[PDB]
Amino acid sequence: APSNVLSTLLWGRACV
């Protein structure tokens, strides 16, 4: 799912 706020930290790794 979209990182939104924390997606960035785990962008392309784990935003869920």
State the DSSP H helix or E strand holding residue 14, giving kind and residue range, or none if neither.
none
Q: How many CB atoms lie within 10 A of CB 15?
A: 15
Structure tokens at 8: 């960035």
Distance CA(10)–CA(3), nearest Å, equals 8
Experimental method: NMR
How many helical (H) and strand (E) elements, i.e. helices and strands, does the chain have? 0, 0
Give 9's contacts (C-beta < 8 A, 6+ positions apart).
3
Give 6's contacts (C-beta < 8 A, 6+ positions apart).
15
Distance CA(8)–CA(16), nearest Å, equals 11
Q: What is the dihedral of CA 5, 3, 6, 12, to 10 degrees?
A: -140
CB 3 within 8 A of CB 9: yes
DSSP 1-13: ---TTTTTTTTTT
Structure tokens at 7: 């997606």
